[PDB]
Amino acid sequence: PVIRKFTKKNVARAKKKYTPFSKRFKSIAAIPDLTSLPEFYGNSSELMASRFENKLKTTQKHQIVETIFSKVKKQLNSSYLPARENEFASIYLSAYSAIESDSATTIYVAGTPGVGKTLTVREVVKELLSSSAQREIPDFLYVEINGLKMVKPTDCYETLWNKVSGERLTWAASMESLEFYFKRVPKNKKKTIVVLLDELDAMVTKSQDIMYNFFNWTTYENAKLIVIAVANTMDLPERQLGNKITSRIGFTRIMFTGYTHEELKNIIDLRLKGLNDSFFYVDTKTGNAILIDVRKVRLRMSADAIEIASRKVASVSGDARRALKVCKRAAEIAEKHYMAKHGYGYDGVQTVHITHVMKALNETLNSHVITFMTRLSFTAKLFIYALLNLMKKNGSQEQELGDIVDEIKLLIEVNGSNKFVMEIAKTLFQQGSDNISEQLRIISWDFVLNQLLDAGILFKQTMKNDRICCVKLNISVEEAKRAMNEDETLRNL
């Protein structure tokens, strides 16, 4: 038949309809009551997610063994609170004064990552669902739009209209459908919907039209939506959104500030209230601890260890997740000590203390580049030394490679007295043998270029001439200076 210019044999199209909600009936006066419709708002076939559930469950077998520290490493996972009250109260009031008043508000929260904003927002929505179950308010359909959980930044329309309506269209039909449903359909036939815009600064793409529409459907009188959009920087509509959309977002702008050391200590106290200073019935044979041969054991997650883990993480960025990561690494270190000391293996009291949590606090404050450039090869340290002493002559940070080569040759020829360098300068140029001429480059030159290029110490510009290819120290010069002073041979060479 035809001979085609190229082929698209691996193409997969969804089953999604093109005609929007505006052309269902073509009668605005005869729109049916959308709330108690069979398909709308999740009233039919809501097993549409729980099809894949009996795939990742296999055998209920073989008697898994918990330990004395496996309990704390389970309670330090993702899961009143004395942390966020003046934010929870204002957000729940600002979202309750629109649920009761059939309004169209927009709340704006923001904060550096870890300050509990999505936790308080989801608890606000859980409490408002409890209020809807107590029937002091109307009910709503809850939609969470995560900014990064989607492959296309315009799929927000598709998932919002799908969650509202039970039908899935393409993204253009979904945005026209949502535009009609939020402009023209009267407030007697729509129950309200609350929208969580999780990680808003990932849908600003190329038009700002999604950011336009989700904050311009809320300026309408006939649309009962509440947008509780979270963010990652407080001045986001002053940096990357227009001033008109800044006026749309408005003036609420409730910031989730960082935590304090007292708040973080209270957080770890509530996380370990059920386990600290309690009693466990371990067995000498395995180690299987059970909370209320058999040994009654305490567990002192010490408050000084908690507060010295909390003060540093309260200083740096104040995150109630990084505090849990520190206090879980401490329990991991304790469990490793316990299992290695007792020979237990998988199938007195126990403590977590200051000089035991300092390893968990020091595991993320180590630059393993100095202990890398010390264990580097001699030719790689000689490369770094040639680059380091060319810098005092030049002052560019961007030395060529033909210069490094001649500087290495200069150092080897000008040190002809040292016993180490006369033993090594034969092998450095000829691999210790004859029937090999004196090479222009040292042996392992491309190897120690690449071993620093892949490691990110070195930084070479792309070109075909490996005499004028510039080379930069990507890490630093001060740490290279402090790493080249422990060699016993390069300290004089």
Binding site: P1, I3, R4, K5, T7, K9
Partner: protein
């Protein structure tokens, strides 16, 4: 560049082979020249024709001639090259590379096509 020459050349080859016959989709490279004998059943004799040889890159042209030279090993092809030059031959064999020139010195013929020669 070289790949558009190859894709256009094998596209024209597969078009002028499958439309002069009176069904699968192949990739447009010299593999079609390799298995032209078993795709169709006929021997290949493609005659190339470069229109403004003084206006192509000769750097792309000798790369295309090198890329064509590997078609010799397939025993059913016969490549013929036709160069339409609007200048002299000392300006084509100055810009080409010498190995391509010694490959082109195997069965070359010249032909003066101009309506001022031979009034």
């Amino acid at each position: 560049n070289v790949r558009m020459m190859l894709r256009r050349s094998m596209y024209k080859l597969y078009s002028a082979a499958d439309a002069e016959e009176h069904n699968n989709d192949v990739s447009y490279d010299l593999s079609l020249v390799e298995n032209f004998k078993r795709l169709f059943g006929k021997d290949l004799a493609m005659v190339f024709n470069f229109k403004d040889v003084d206006s192509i890159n000769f750097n792309t042209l000798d790369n295309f001639i090198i890329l064509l030279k590997s078609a010799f090993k397939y025993d059913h092809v016969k490549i013929s090259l036709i160069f339409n030059i609007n200048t002299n031959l000392s300006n084509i064999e100055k810009n080409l590379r010498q190995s391509t020139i010694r490959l082109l010195k195997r069965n070359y013929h010249k032909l003066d096509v101009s309506s001022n020669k031979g009034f």
